[PDB]
Amino acid sequence: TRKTYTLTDYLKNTYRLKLYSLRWISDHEYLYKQENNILVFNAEYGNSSVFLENSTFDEFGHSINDYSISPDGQFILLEYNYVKQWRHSYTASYDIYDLNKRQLITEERIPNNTQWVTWSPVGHKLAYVWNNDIYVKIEPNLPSYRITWTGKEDIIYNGITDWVYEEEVFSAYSALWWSPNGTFLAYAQFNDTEVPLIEYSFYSDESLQYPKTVRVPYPKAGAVNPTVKFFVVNTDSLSSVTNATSIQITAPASMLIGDHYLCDVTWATQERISLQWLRRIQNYSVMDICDYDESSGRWNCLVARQHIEMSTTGWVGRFRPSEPHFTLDGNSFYKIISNEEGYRHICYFQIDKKDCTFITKGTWEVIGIEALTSDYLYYISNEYKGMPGGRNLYKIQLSDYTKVTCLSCELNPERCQYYSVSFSKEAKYYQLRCSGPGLPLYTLHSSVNDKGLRVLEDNSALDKMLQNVQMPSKKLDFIILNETKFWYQMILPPHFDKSKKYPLLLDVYAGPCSQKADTVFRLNWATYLASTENIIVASFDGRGSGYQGDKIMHAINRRLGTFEVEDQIEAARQFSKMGFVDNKRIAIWGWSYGGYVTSMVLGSGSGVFKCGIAVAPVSRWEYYDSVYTERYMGLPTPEDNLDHYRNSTVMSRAENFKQVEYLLIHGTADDNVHFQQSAQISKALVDVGVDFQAMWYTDEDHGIASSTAHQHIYTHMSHFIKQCFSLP
Amino acid sequence: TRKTYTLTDYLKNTYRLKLYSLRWISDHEYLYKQENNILVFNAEYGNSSVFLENSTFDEFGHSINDYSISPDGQFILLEYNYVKQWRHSYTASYDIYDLNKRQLITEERIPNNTQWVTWSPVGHKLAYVWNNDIYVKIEPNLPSYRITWTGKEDIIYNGITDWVYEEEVFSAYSALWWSPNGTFLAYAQFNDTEVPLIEYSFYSDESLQYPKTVRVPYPKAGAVNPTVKFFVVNTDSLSSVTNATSIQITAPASMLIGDHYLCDVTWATQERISLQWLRRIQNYSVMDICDYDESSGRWNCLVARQHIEMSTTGWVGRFRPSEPHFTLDGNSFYKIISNEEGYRHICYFQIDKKDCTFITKGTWEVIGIEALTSDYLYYISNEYKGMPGGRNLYKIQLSDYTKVTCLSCELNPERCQYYSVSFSKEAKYYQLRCSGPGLPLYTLHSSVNDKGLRVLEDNSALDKMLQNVQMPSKKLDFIILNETKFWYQMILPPHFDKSKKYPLLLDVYAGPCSQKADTVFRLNWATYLASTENIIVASFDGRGSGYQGDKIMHAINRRLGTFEVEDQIEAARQFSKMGFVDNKRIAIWGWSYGGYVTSMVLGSGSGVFKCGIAVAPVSRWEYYDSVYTERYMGLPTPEDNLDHYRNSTVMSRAENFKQVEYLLIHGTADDNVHFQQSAQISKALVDVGVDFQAMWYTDEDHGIASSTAHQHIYTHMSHFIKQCFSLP
Ligand SMILES: CS(=O)(=O)c1ccc(-c2noc([C@@H](CC3CC3)[C@H](N)C(F)=C3CCCC3)n2)c(Cl)c1
Ligand SMILES: CS(=O)(=O)c1ccc(-c2noc([C@@H](CC3CC3)[C@H](N)C(F)=C3CCCC3)n2)c(Cl)c1
Ligand SMILES: *[C@@H]1O[C@H](CO)[C@@H](O[C@@H]2O[C@H](CO)[C@@H](O)[C@H](O)[C@H]2NC(C)=O)[C@H](O)[C@H]1NC(C)=O
Ligand SMILES: *[C@@H]1O[C@H](CO)[C@@H](O[C@@H]2O[C@H](CO)[C@@H](O)[C@H](O)[C@H]2NC(C)=O)[C@H](O)[C@H]1NC(C)=O
Ligand SMILES: *[C@@H]1O[C@H](CO)[C@@H](O[C@@H]2O[C@H](CO)[C@@H](O)[C@H](O)[C@H]2NC(C)=O)[C@H](O)[C@H]1NC(C)=O
Ligand SMILES: *[C@@H]1O[C@H](CO)[C@@H](O[C@@H]2O[C@H](CO)[C@@H](O)[C@H](O)[C@H]2NC(C)=O)[C@H](O)[C@H]1NC(C)=O
Ligand SMILES: *[C@@H]1O[C@H](CO)[C@@H](O[C@@H]2O[C@H](CO)[C@@H](O)[C@H](O)[C@H]2NC(C)=O)[C@H](O)[C@H]1NC(C)=O
Ligand SMILES: *[C@@H]1O[C@H](CO)[C@@H](O[C@@H]2O[C@H](CO)[C@@H](O)[C@H](O)[C@H]2NC(C)=O)[C@H](O)[C@H]1NC(C)=O
Ligand SMILES: *[C@@H]1O[C@H](CO)[C@@H](O[C@H]2O[C@H](CO)[C@@H](O)[C@H](O)[C@H]2NC(C)=O)[C@H](O)[C@H]1NC(C)=O
Ligand SMILES: *[C@@H]1O[C@H](CO)[C@@H](O[C@H]2O[C@H](CO)[C@@H](O)[C@H](O)[C@H]2NC(C)=O)[C@H](O)[C@H]1NC(C)=O
Ligand SMILES: *[C@H]1O[C@H](CO)[C@@H](O[C@@H]2O[C@H](CO)[C@@H](O)[C@H](O)[C@H]2NC(C)=O)[C@H](O)[C@H]1NC(C)=O
Ligand SMILES: *[C@@H]1O[C@H](CO)[C@@H](O)[C@H](O)[C@H]1NC(C)=O
Ligand SMILES: *[C@@H]1O[C@H](CO)[C@@H](O)[C@H](O)[C@H]1NC(C)=O
Ligand SMILES: *[C@@H]1O[C@H](CO)[C@@H](O)[C@H](O)[C@H]1NC(C)=O
Ligand SMILES: *[C@@H]1O[C@H](CO)[C@@H](O)[C@H](O)[C@H]1NC(C)=O
Ligand SMILES: *[C@@H]1O[C@H](CO)[C@@H](O)[C@H](O)[C@H]1NC(C)=O
Ligand SMILES: *[C@@H]1O[C@H](CO)[C@@H](O)[C@H](O)[C@H]1NC(C)=O
Ligand code: NA
């Protein structure tokens, strides 16, 4: 009898998914890490050579965390002493190695504790942030030029984001953007002077006698937000003037009237940059297109080139206004926007004309624009077979929009339905990455004829291994509610027999624009639960979910904690009505937003669920950050949406928890969803005399991803689920 | 057929013990609150009168928390707006009512947020502390005189103790001491300038958007300690024109050579005060006796009147040097000190003589000196029947030490074996308070011939109720370990049948000088466990325990976490050998020091315990405060006792928890044993992959005593124990 996929298999990663991460260094070459060393591959023929021997830095005296080659291939940036901060931010040390002279630069070294470093897009200039100030080095071994002097820990951030901009606006720590050929360096400056601080203890190693209090500028809903300014400096003038002038580009009058955000920075040409601003009430956005004025050394944004993007049904963009993709001459651009039917499609804009032209349309959506050449635009969409959970690459002819070719749909339709892509520098080649429903498959293709060049990694080794394992199956389908299709997926135990009643676990997230039902292949906790414990693990995408139009996504506008919670309950009823579910054993669990929904569902009094697990849940929206929360909830004030803010808390439903078994878990060093959120849930439960299970994870953050904690939480959760389902 | 004592009975206080808390106001009368009416009783005849009507303040507009009548009966201090701080400290608002003119004083009233207030010992002067400074009021309606001007939150404390002195030295917030007739007001001043602060989050009500960070000067083991100064001010010569002049009494040179503490202040006469100082290495203490000089107006402390107290086997005193009891003329005093055999007995001192004479002796100990007259000294001891867990009142003839009379031993030997006492002003009368083994019994007595005047409260009402309940019994006995007898107690289920096998829960504290095996009658969680769940609850006093001499108490000197932990395992091992114990179901639980021992036991690898619960445990001594920790452990420096500090942590034993079920609980706002201690235990268990149960209590402190949290913790622990023992 074949073994099953056990908890230990998951926690010990015995069945490893292989991938193929390459880094394009030009239009026909990419770097690949093999046998600890770095190889350089010729895309056209597949032949390679050693770029950097694995023994090159054996006497470096430091474990290299990552590397980065300068655009011109003359230098390599070595990163070590890596110290993680938030989701994207971290600090590290850096050394620059001269590839030609094959030596390690020892003079004018990048400072230790550098917050961010980046090569110019061409050549080998460097810009880095240290102590919250920007510095530029024209040459790796020469002194750097300081660009800002206002940097101040936790107060003024130049070239880097503060907590909320990192997490909710830029999805990145860096806040600097080199112009195309590297002459200009643009950057943002954030001022958190009046932003309140979240404070929590960090215990550290046992040796630390007094706990440390971590303090970070974090604006909760309705609180004082950081303010922002934008500047551009001409780096080519640095060696000619004592102190190069940072020219400020001010936000438009429509934004200055109130609180706002800088939400996108995109260079169009060597002397043209585009900026998008968003009002704190996120349903109004403005894009300025600014040109350099060689006679005044200033930047001017003509109102005739300003574009407005607003929404009457919700917020602007999936999570923020989309980025523009400019044609070479910078006189036009393509951008994903919601059409009149509420579906996100590609619109073609002339920079000085306010009306755009949609080049795609249909009851499906464009996920992202991947590359633009003089003749073709490549994008990913979920058009294929009307499956919102699938992803494919398409190519559209710019001289004839009726000519759209799907480049990935038919490559291997049974094994591959979810693709992402990586183009070379000038889009001459592209790597396709299939992630499901079958085992991931990585392939290389030539753009000139769209012919497949070869298979990079097919995961044959893993396929061989899984053959001797009783793996579960996955079903992706939909149910019709109110004349609208809503998709779900189910991880089914091996030898699934529809004539039997299986216990069911609803795996939920359900936040705005989320998608938990898709064609991706995963090896996770649900895999073990279905394979070894014979539990059906389901997920449902209801109102508020993404990639299916604004009608479904904006259904929860200003009303978080309502329809997305209710639809999760309704989904459980629908599943039980399918006949193979044991109504006495229906549980629910989720992490983060999923923790919130789980908690709201368990406290609804529905009677449908027996038990549930909430990990790092939100419990009241006023405790979460402003940028994310206000996007969907507006402001927590009596004149705006305070009433719904107060009505959608987990705490107000404490009394209903007497009807269920609950396990609440939270990391004490969660800088994102503060431990405070679960601290208030537990106190409310204690106040109404409700017994429940709890677990805090010392010094773990929102991901509770440290190796030991990860193994510990899933083990603890498994025992809880097995007990609730009366499983041996 | 009849009901048992249930968990609800314990949590809802269904069966309440009646008390009789009286307040002696003279040598013949006492105050007693009845029906919200303060009555005055005549001890000789038992007749009473109403002293203050419950309706006297029906329109006061504030809920009175407590009252305090001036010594002369002319005024009554009304306490309201009570806000608790630490174990003894709190702030409140006060109003003074004139009992003669039946009027509430409205002029020059005590400020709100007053930290401490106290009437002079005679008359009606008042002294209070506000904003860390001392004020004196000669008359209730007159302006107060400012005594100190250096008070500063968390830095300089005048007349009140800082955190560590409140908790570990004075067991009080007050640091003010009126002379016998109220002429002088002595006070201490604490300086915490360089004492590090413990910081932790306080979440508050749900409405608080950002958690608050509480910061308390708290010296952990080996850290910088607060410094102290002592002053005496003449309150009869205060000037409304000039600032009061405080006279300082400096500590002796043998103390000034390094860190030290002020540990006792006791007035001897109207013009003589005694102070005891303790070195930071708590095995050397010095008592100074100081006399006021009318000429120079200074206080002089003759070296000839100095008394040294040291210990070679441990620290000085049970928790600190004992207090002296001076004779009327103040020329000699009695004090409890450890004799040559290591037993605490009463020594008689001459103020100018170095050698003191022991007036009691034997293999038992004097617990405390209760009253002193020219002919007799009254004291409580555990001499009777050689039972260290019993307490009786004795009097010894001062002119012939061979004449010792037990005054409570034979009153009712079956019902009463544990007494405390309260004497009237000149010891003319005394109230005896019997607290076990039968129901509490309060009686009043006359000293001249030790007549038993009357029964004040006999709890006959509770006795009637308990008749219809299957109550557990209590067995108190001993076992021998190396020629030494160690006592234990067992709470046995109703209808105990020695032929049956019962599961057993070891209830432990085991800190230095602790006593968990005694003759006290208690209605607690253990009562329910024995009565309703049929669980035997045992407690054992091993090495390190008190009231049995230094050989036993000092056995753990510089070695916490060793013998007291090993002796609990040994006792359990022996209990398991008994025919009525199910060796497969033995558990252990403890709170505070008991949580530490419970954890150390469960991590010992003994295999004797199936499960255990630790509530607010200490986990490593370097995290606990200096005064208590160093008393037993010396300093955590390599030259002193660092190795043992590092060997006695719970964390180093994590691996051994793999074979036991463990439940770890802790309040997040514990200012005493910081949450940090449990946060490090959990992290260590996670680190070695051991599963366990946990529960944090939001905003609860060391007592986890708020009404809802109290019910919730005991409910949660009951489920855990029943589960561990497989009980319905
Ligand atoms: C359905 S799922 O694949 O598990 C999934 C998981 C996470 C998200 C997600 N949505 O916002 C965010 C984060 C934004 C990042 C920039 C993306 C967001 N800041 C966050 F962590 C939250 C936790 C509780 C409330 C919001 N993550 C989404 Cl939409 C979907
Ligand atoms: C045996 S028992 O009745 O449960 C019991 C309970 C408490 C104590 C006790 N010993 O020190 C203390 C406290 C001192 C106060 C002045 C009394 C002490 N500061 C404390 F809270 C500790 C908690 C962990 C380490 C010590 N309490 C003792 Cl000796 C015995
Ligand atoms: C892949 O193989 C080709 C064929 O040998 C290599 O092509 C060389 O290309 C350079 C131009 O950069 C010519 O000067 C040479 O004539 C070619 N090689 C030889 C030996 O003549 C190519 O360098 C290889 N690429 C990698 C990454 O190994
Ligand atoms: C960051 O913003 C703060 C405003 O909150 C600025 O501080 C003010 O600066 C002005 C001008 O000097 C002073 O008059 C005010 O007293 C300051 N207010 C506060 C609250 O500090 C600060 O100058 C800004 N910093 C930068 C680099 O822009
Ligand atoms: C380089 O130029 C900048 C801009 O003028 C200088 O920054 C200003 O410094 C003055 C005084 O130090 C402040 O009052 C201004 O608030 C600063 N403005 C900005 C935008 O930062 C900077 O000091 C100059 N550096 C040197 C070395 O001269
Ligand atoms: C990168 O682009 C910049 C901006 O267009 C170029 O700099 C300009 O060069 C022209 C000459 O072609 C001059 O007339 C302008 O004065 C320059 N402008 C500025 C702001 O410097 C630059 O030459 C380009 N770099 C490269 C390597 O081609
Ligand atoms: C409390 O005791 C003090 C000190 O013995 C008394 O004050 C002394 O009283 C005598 C006689 O009246 C004076 O000659 C001394 O000069 C006083 N000494 C001081 C330091 O004041 C005081 O009278 C007593 N108070 C009461 C109420 O008995
Ligand atoms: C009080 O206790 C201290 C500490 O145990 C004793 O001081 C010394 O302690 C060190 C260890 O820290 C030993 O090596 C010494 O032998 C101890 N004595 C001396 C003189 O250094 C001290 O002896 C104790 N005092 C009394 C009166 O017993
Ligand atoms: C207790 O009863 C006695 C009488 O036996 C009361 O009497 C004493 O005090 C009265 C007022 O203070 C006087 O009027 C009596 O003369 C006096 N009697 C004696 C023998 O001295 C006494 O007040 C009562 N005490 C209380 C508190 O009620
Ligand atoms: C409280 O104690 C501090 C020392 O901890 C006293 O200040 C002293 O220490 C300072 C460091 O914080 C030094 O800078 C000062 O020179 C020193 N003070 C003097 C007079 O030299 C402080 O004065 C104390 N406060 C009181 C009221 O005694
Ligand atoms: C301490 O606080 C109380 C309550 O505020 C003060 O009493 C007055 O309270 C009324 C309303 O209850 C207010 O209008 C007054 O402002 C308060 N003060 C006065 C003088 O009336 C009380 O006075 C305060 N105590 C002290 C010493 O200031
Ligand atoms: C590169 O180094 C690895 C280990 O550091 C070694 O196994 C391998 O042999 C080296 N590469 C080649 C091509 O030999
Ligand atoms: C970085 O820090 C290391 C260790 O402190 C030191 O040896 C090195 O010189 C530093 N380098 C720079 C550029 O500061
Ligand atoms: C933006 O949102 C606010 C709040 O709902 C609303 O009052 C305003 O009319 C909206 N603007 C647009 C263009 O929809
Ligand atoms: C005082 O009020 C209480 C109510 O708590 C009442 O029981 C008592 O009878 C009252 N006192 C008198 C003398 O009636
Ligand atoms: C008393 O001392 C304080 C503090 O130095 C001072 O402010 C005040 O004026 C003094 N009062 C008199 C009467 O000297
Ligand atoms: C005596 O008993 C104690 C425990 O009571 C034990 O630690 C010790 O080893 C025994 N032997 C001696 C000589 O003390
Ligand atoms: Na009597």
Q: In sequence order, what DSSP letters do the residues of A309-345 get, joined into one string?
A: EE-SSS-SSSSSPPPPEE-TTSSEEEEEEE-TTS-EE
Q: Which atom of ligand 15 is nearest to the CA of B50?
A: 13
- Examine residue B437 and say whether the peptide bond preceding it is cis (omega within 30 degrees of 0): yes
Altogether, the residues listed in chain A come to a count of 728
HEC readout, A598-629: HHHHHCCCCCCCCEEEEECCCCCHHHCEHHHH
Q: What is the C-alpha to C-alpha distance for residues B426 and B380, in angstroms, rounded to an integer?
A: 18
Reading the block at residue B120, the tokens are: 């002079």
DSSP state of A565: H
Q: What is the C-alpha to C-alpha distance for residues B100 and B74, in angstroms, rounded to an integer?
A: 6
- Ligand 1 centroid to Cα of residue A540, in Å, is 16
What amino acid occupies position A258? G
b or e along B412-426 (b: 16 or more beta carbons within 10 Å of the residue's beta carbon)?
eeeebbbbbbbbbee
**Measuring CA to CA, which residue among B654, B687, B467, B505 is closest to residue B585?**
B505
Asked if B359 and B343 touch (Cβ cutoff 8 Å), the reply is no
Q: How far is CA A4 from CA A465, A466, A472, A710, in A?
A: 12, 10, 9, 21
Residues in contact with A380: Cβ distance below 8 Å, sequence separation at least 6, in sequence order = A366, A367, A368, A370, A391, A392, A393, A394, A419, A420, A421
Q: What is the C-alpha to C-alpha distance for residues B78 and B97, in angstroms, rounded to an integer?
A: 7
Q: What is the chain A residue with the closest CA to B678?
A: A698
Q: What is the C-alpha to C-alpha distance for residues A469 and A439, in angstroms, rounded to an integer?
A: 15
Asked if A502 and A535 touch (Cβ cutoff 8 Å), the reply is yes
**Pocket lining: B367 vs ligand 9, CB cutoff 6 Å:** no
Q: Backbone phi, then psi, for A648, in 5-degree steps?
A: -105, 25
Residues in contact with B20: Cβ distance below 8 Å, sequence separation at least 6, in sequence order = B32, B431, B433, B442, B456, B457
Asked if A557 and A314 touch (Cβ cutoff 8 Å), the reply is yes
Q: What is the C-alpha to C-alpha distance for residues B15 and B521, in angstroms, rounded to an integer?
A: 13
Q: What is the C-alpha to C-alpha distance for residues B476 and B471, in angstroms, rounded to an integer?
A: 16
Asked if A434 and A391 touch (Cβ cutoff 8 Å), the reply is no
Interface with B, mutate which of A202, A214, A646, A686 (most B CBs under 10 A) = A686
Reading the block at residue A104, the tokens are: 């390690």
Residues in contact with B311: Cβ distance below 8 Å, sequence separation at least 6, in sequence order = B283, B284, B338, B550, B554
DSSP codes joined into one string, B569-584: HHHHHHHHTSTTEEEE
Q: What is the C-alpha to C-alpha distance for residues A623 and A220, in angstroms, rounded to an integer?
A: 6
> Closest ligand to B544 CA?
2
> Closest ligand to A558 CA?
14
**Measuring CA to CA, which residue among B539, B685, B706 is closest to residue B619?**
B685
Domain architecture of chain A: domains with CATH: 1-13+468-728 (3.40.50.1820), 17-459 (2.140.10.30)
Residues in contact with B92: Cβ distance below 8 Å, sequence separation at least 6, in sequence order = B65, B79, B80, B81, B82, B83, B114
Measured from the Cβ of residue B211, the count of other Cβ atoms closer than 10 Å reads: 22
3-state secondary structure of B88: coil
Measured from the Cβ of residue A646, the count of other Cβ atoms closer than 10 Å reads: 15
Q: Do residue B682 and residue A674 have CB atoms under 8 angstroms apart?
A: no
**Measuring CA to CA, which residue among B462, B471, B527, B503 is closest to residue B3?**
B471
Asked if A309 and A337 touch (Cβ cutoff 8 Å), the reply is yes
Q: A223 to chain B: which residues are within 8 Å by CB?
A: 209
Write the residue with the smallest CA distance to atom 4 of ligand 16.
Answer: B149
Q: Is the dihedral of CA B322, B328, B330, B334 positive or negative?
A: negative
Which residues of A are known to be catalytic?
592, 670, 702
Q: How far is CA B260 from CA A649, B229, B256, B265, B277, in A?
A: 52, 11, 7, 15, 7
Q: Backbone phi, then psi, for A440, in 5-degree steps?
A: -50, 140
Q: How far is CA B259 from CA A210, B217, B254, in A?
A: 21, 17, 11
Q: What is the dihedral of CA A164, A169, A170, A172, to 10 degrees?
A: 30
Residues in contact with A180: Cβ distance below 8 Å, sequence separation at least 6, in sequence order = A121, A122, A267, A269, A270
Asked if A134 and A148 touch (Cβ cutoff 8 Å), the reply is yes
Helix, strand, coil distribution of chain B in percent, nearest 5: 15, 35, 45
Reading the block at residue B453, the tokens are: 């005047």
What amino acid occupies position A215? R
Q: What is the C-alpha to C-alpha distance for residues A303 and A292, in angstroms, rounded to an integer?
A: 15
Q: Which long-range contacts (CB under 8 A, 24 or more apart) does B127-132 make?
A: B127/B159, B127/B176, B127/B178, B127/B185, B127/B235, B128/B94, B129/B158, B129/B159, B129/B160, B129/B176, B132/B156, B132/B157, B132/B158, B132/B160
**Measuring CA to CA, which residue among B682, B199, B667, B203 is closest to residue A674?**
B203
Q: A699 to chain B: which residues are within 8 Å by CB?
A: 679, 683
Asked if B664 and B718 touch (Cβ cutoff 8 Å), the reply is no
Q: How far is CA B609 from the centre of its chain?
A: 31
Residues in contact with B460: Cβ distance below 8 Å, sequence separation at least 6, in sequence order = none
Q: Do residue A689 and residue B709 have CB atoms under 8 angstroms apart?
A: no
Write the residue with the smallest CA distance to atom 9 of ligand 10.
Answer: B193
**Measuring CA to CA, which residue among B537, B422, B391, B531 is closest to residue B466?**
B531
Measured from the Cβ of residue B60, the count of other Cβ atoms closer than 10 Å reads: 13
- Ligand 2 centroid to Cα of residue B163, in Å, is 15
b or e along B306-321 (b: 16 or more beta carbons within 10 Å of the residue's beta carbon)?
bbebebeebbbbbbbb
**Measuring CA to CA, which residue among B171, B216, B172 is closest to residue B198?**
B216
**Measuring CA to CA, which residue among B137, B131, B169 is closest to residue B152?**
B131
Residue A89, min C-alpha distance to chain B (Å) = 24
For residue A254, count CB atoms less than 10 angstroms from its CB and return exposed for 0-12, middle for 13-18, buried for 19 or more.
middle
- Examine residue B472 and say whether the peptide bond preceding it is cis (omega within 30 degrees of 0): no
**Pocket lining: B307 vs ligand 2, CB cutoff 6 Å:** no
Residues having CB closer than 6 A to ligand 16 are B 149, 242-243
Q: B202 to chain A: which residues are within 8 Å by CB?
A: none
- Ligand 7 centroid to Cα of residue B30, in Å, is 28
Q: What is the C-alpha to C-alpha distance for residues B53 and B56, in angstroms, rounded to an integer?
A: 5
CB-nearest to A220 from B209, B698, B712 is: B209
Reading the block at residue B492, the tokens are: 């046995």
Q: Do residue B689 and residue A676 have CB atoms under 8 angstroms apart?
A: no
Q: A197 to chain B: which residues are within 8 Å by CB?
A: 210
b or e along A405-434 (b: 16 or more beta carbons within 10 Å of the residue's beta carbon)?
eebbbebeeeebbbbebbbbeeebbbbbbb
**Pocket lining: A183 vs ligand 6, CB cutoff 6 Å:** yes
Q: Which atom of ligand 9 is nearest to the CA of B49?
A: 28
Interface with A, mutate which of B194, B200, B205, B206 (most A CBs under 10 A) = B206
Q: What is the C-alpha to C-alpha distance for residues B32 and B21, in angstroms, rounded to an integer?
A: 7
Q: What is the C-alpha to C-alpha distance for residues B247 and B158, in angstroms, rounded to an integer?
A: 14
Q: What is the C-alpha to C-alpha distance for residues A367 and A379, in angstroms, rounded to an integer?
A: 7
Question: For B717, left (φ over 0), alpha (ψ -120 to 50), or beta?
Answer: alpha
Asked if A151 and A183 touch (Cβ cutoff 8 Å), the reply is no
Can you name the residues that pair with A620 across neighbouring β-strands? none
- Ligand 15 centroid to Cα of residue B567, in Å, is 53
3-state secondary structure of A232: strand
Elucidation technique: X-ray
Reading the block at residue B4, the tokens are: 């048992």
> Closest ligand to A44 CA?
3
For residue B147, count CB atoms less than 10 angstroms from its CB and return exposed for 0-12, middle for 13-18, buried for 19 or more.
buried
Q: How far is CA B666 from CA A584, A662, B693, B703, in A?
A: 34, 19, 12, 10
- Helix axis angle for B563-576 and B593-602, nearest 10°, is 70
**Pocket lining: B239 vs ligand 9, CB cutoff 6 Å:** no
H or E stretch at A631? helix A626-633
b or e along A598-627 (b: 16 or more beta carbons within 10 Å of the residue's beta carbon)?
bbbbbbbebebbbbbbbbbbbbbbbbbbbb
Reading the block at residue B571, the tokens are: 């006792």
Dump strand ranges (E) for B322-418: 325-326, 332-338, 344-350, 357-358, 366-372, 376-381, 392-397, 404-406
**Measuring CA to CA, which residue among A548, A471, A484 is closest to residue A516?**
A548
Q: B719 to chain A: which residues are within 8 Å by CB?
A: 691
Q: How far is CA A303 from the centre of its chain?
A: 33
Residues having CB closer than 6 A to ligand 12 are A 35-37, 54
Strands in B29-34's sheet, in edge-to-edge order, are B23-24, B29-34, B37-42, B48-52
Q: Which is it for strands B469-470 and B3-4: parallel, antiparallel or unpaired? A: parallel
Q: Give me the residue label for tokens 């994102």.
A: A672
- Ligand 7 centroid to Cα of residue B121, in Å, is 15
Q: What is the C-alpha to C-alpha distance for residues B319 and A415, in angstroms, rounded to an integer?
A: 75
Q: Backbone phi, then psi, for B633, in 5-degree steps?
A: -110, 5
Measured from the Cβ of residue A300, the count of other Cβ atoms closer than 10 Å reads: 12
Q: What is the C-alpha to C-alpha distance for residues B692 and B559, in angstroms, rounded to an integer?
A: 28
**Measuring CA to CA, which residue among A585, A612, A595 is closest to residue A504?**
A585
**Measuring CA to CA, which residue among B500, B509, B483, B486 is closest to residue B571?**
B486
